[PDB]
Amino acid sequence: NKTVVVTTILESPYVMMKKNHEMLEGNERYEGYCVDLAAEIAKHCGFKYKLTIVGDGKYGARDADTKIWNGMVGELVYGKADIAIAPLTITLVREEVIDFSKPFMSLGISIMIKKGTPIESAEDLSKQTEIAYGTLDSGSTKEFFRRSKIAVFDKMWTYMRSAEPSVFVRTTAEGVARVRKSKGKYAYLLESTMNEYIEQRKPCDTMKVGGNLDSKGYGIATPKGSSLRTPVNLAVLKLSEQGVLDKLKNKWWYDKGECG
Amino acid sequence: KTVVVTTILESPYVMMKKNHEMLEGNERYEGYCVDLAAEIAKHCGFKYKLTIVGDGKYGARDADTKIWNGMVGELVYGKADIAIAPLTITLVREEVIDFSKPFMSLGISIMIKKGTPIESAEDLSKQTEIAYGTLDSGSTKEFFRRSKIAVFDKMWTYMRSAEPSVFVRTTAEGVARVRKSKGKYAYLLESTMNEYIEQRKPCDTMKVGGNLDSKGYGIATPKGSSLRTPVNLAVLKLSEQGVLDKLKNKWWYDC
Numbered sequence: 169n170k171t172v173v174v175t176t177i178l179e180s181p182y183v184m185m186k187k188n189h190e191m192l193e194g195n196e197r198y199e200g201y202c203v204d205l206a207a208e209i210a211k212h213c214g215f216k217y218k219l220t221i222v223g224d225g226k227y228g229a230r231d232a233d234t235k236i237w238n239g240m241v242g243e244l245v246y247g248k249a250d251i252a253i254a255p256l257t258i259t260l261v262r263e264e265v266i267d268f269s270k271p272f273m274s275l276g277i278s279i280m281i282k283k284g285t286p287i288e289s290a291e292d293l294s295k296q297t298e299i300a301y302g303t304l305d306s307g308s309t310k311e312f313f314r315r316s317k318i319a320v321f322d323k324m325w326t327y328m329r330s331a332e333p334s335v336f337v338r339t340t341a342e343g344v345a346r347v348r349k350s351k352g353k354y355a356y357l358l359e360s361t362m363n364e365y366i367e368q369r370k371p372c373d374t375m376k377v378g379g380n381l382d383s384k385g386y387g388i389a390t391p392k393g394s395s396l397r398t399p400v401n402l403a404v405l406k407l408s409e410q411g412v413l414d415k416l417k418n419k420w421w422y423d424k425g426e427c428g
Numbered sequence: 429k430t431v432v433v434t435t436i437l438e439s440p441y442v443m444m445k446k447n448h449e450m451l452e453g454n455e456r457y458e459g460y461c462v463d464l465a466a467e468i469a470k471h472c473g474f475k476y477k478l479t480i481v482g483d484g485k486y487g488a489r490d491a492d493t494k495i496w497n498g499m500v501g502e503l504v505y506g507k508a509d510i511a512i513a514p515l516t517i518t519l520v521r522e523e524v525i526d527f528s529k530p531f532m533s534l535g536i537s538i539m540i541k542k543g544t545p546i547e548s549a550e551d552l553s554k555q556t557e558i559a560y561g562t563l564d565s566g567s568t569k570e571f572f573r574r575s576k577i578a579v580f581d582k583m584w585t586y587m588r589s590a591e592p593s594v595f596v597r598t599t600a601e602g603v604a605r606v607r608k609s610k611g612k613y614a615y616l617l618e619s620t621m622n623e624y625i626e627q628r629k630p631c632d633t634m635k636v637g638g639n640l641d642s643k644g645y646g647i648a649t650p651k652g653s654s655l656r657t658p659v660n661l662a663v664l665k666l667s668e669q670g671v672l673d674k675l676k677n678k679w680w681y682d683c
């Protein structure tokens with residue numbers, strides 16, 4: 169039986185480098201929610217696997233010109249990986265080229281501010297120009313704003329797409345740093361999951377504000393026609409019903425809380 | 429061909445319109461799932477007939493005979509082509525039918541009559557004065573039957589042996605039971621239905637504690653159905669276009 173190649177992404181607390189990683193080899197180098205999730209899926213489906221960090225560090229989007237897929241989605245599409253186990257958002261354009269399991273975690277787009285920033289909603293952001301705001305590149309949040317027909321979000325997109333200097337970031341960490349070092353002059357649009365995690369990390373200077381802008385989920389992805397599709401889906405449902413997914417959420421978000 | 433849609437009378441998902449007795453076909457009904465069925469059919473390009481599940485149940489497999497009842501049964505035995513309803517995605521069901529990606533989230537929750545001294549599932553388990561139960565033939569009952577979590581397992585032990593029965597045939601009967609029992613009955617039901625009842629007259633019930641689990645409702649089809657993929661894509665499109673949120677706001681929030 170062949171070793172399953174898992175594509176994932178370095179995104180805290182989903183996949184993180186272990187303290188002693190320089191001593192370690194293979195899967196032992198990593199820890200986090202998706203590392204634990206990969207182990208559980210593999211156990212239930214009965215396969216051996218190798219965790220591999222996506223080469224370009226991206227989630228996945230299709231270039232409007234070339235129509236080529238990048239990120240983890242690209243790795244599945246082009247045969248470079250057998251499965252993605254990551255905070256990968258279930259979307260229509262992605263479901264057209266890969267398969268997703270039932271969602272293992274719920275999330276919505278949300279707003280991160282530096283504490284004390286005079287903003288409490290997306291409407292607030294759209295009605296002013298003093299505080300800049302942006303999203304991650306090559307992900308579902310950027311596509312959300314690009315495609316939205318809702319007035320407030322369309323207004324936000326029109327601003328973001330032409331903002332100078334660029335309001336878009338290559339990694340979540342870059343977005344977080346920009347909030348922290350901009351004296352309240354930058355707000356970051358990101359998924360509630362990542363937002364809530366950062367909010368509980370030192371130096372405890374960020375805050376989630378307003379309601380989630382949408383309601384969606386992360387799913388485990390496989391290339392079309394994969395023999396792993398059905399087993400993985402059943403595994404996710406079993407893990408959900410056994411309470412394992414809730415246990416892993418508490419382990420990596422709330423048991424780790426640093427902000428009291 | 430006309431697609432046969434099985435559904436269930438459950439407010440505000442599917443309800444009889446006023447003066448429904450002189451109405452016919454799909455026009456008899458209104459609600460979130462009625463609107464959803466219309467949207468799915470438009471995006472998938474099929475004509476349909478809404479039908480209320482014959483036995484009024486969601487779907488459970490008999491332990492003895494292994495026969496499925498409810499909407500699940502109707503799909504399994506070919507009596508309906510698709511189920512569009514607040515039907516919970518579960519492992520045992522996913523083994524016999526297919527579910528779309530979920531169109532709505534929910535968790536098991538507690539309904540009390542206002543003033544009932546109960547804050548949580550643990551409160552219910554550590555007392556005997558206030559009775560409590562679930563819907564029969566649904567995912568909530570199965571949840572307690574299967575749980576290995578101490579609090580929930582203790583609640584199951586009590587409920588399965590309670591006399592008279594604490595289980596209701598319909599959600600409405602569970603709600604009416606809470607309302608008529610002077611605080612001596614609590615009801616375990618999905619957060620979605622709980623939250624709907626909370627905002628209706630006589631405003632005498634409320635949801636207490638956090639949800640016991642996290643799951644979703646999906647559109648269900650019999651295995652091998654040509655509707656499976658189109659329906660899934662329709663749900664995702666409706667999600668991303670904001671239609672699902674609009675429908676939720678229309679039927680819940682529009683005490």
Ligand SMILES: CC(C)S(=O)(=O)N[C@H]1Cc2ccc(-c3ccc(F)nc3)cc2C1
Nearest residue numbers: 270271273274384385408532533643644
């Ligand atoms: C594995 C089962 C528990 S699940 O398939 O029900 N997944 C959970 C996790 C999860 C995540 C997202 C959504 C959701 C809800 C509404 C919407 F529009 N889009 C997505 C539902 C659920 C239920």
Ligand SMILES: N[C@@H](CCC(=O)O)C(=O)O
Nearest residue numbers: 227255256257307308309
């Ligand atoms: N989870 C997103 C990435 C994060 C974001 O776009 O905010 C995706 O799969 O594209």
Ligand SMILES: N[C@@H](CCC(=O)O)C(=O)O
Nearest residue numbers: 486514515516566567568
């Ligand atoms: N949504 C449930 C019915 C309601 C309940 O069990 O509380 C099901 O599909 O079985």
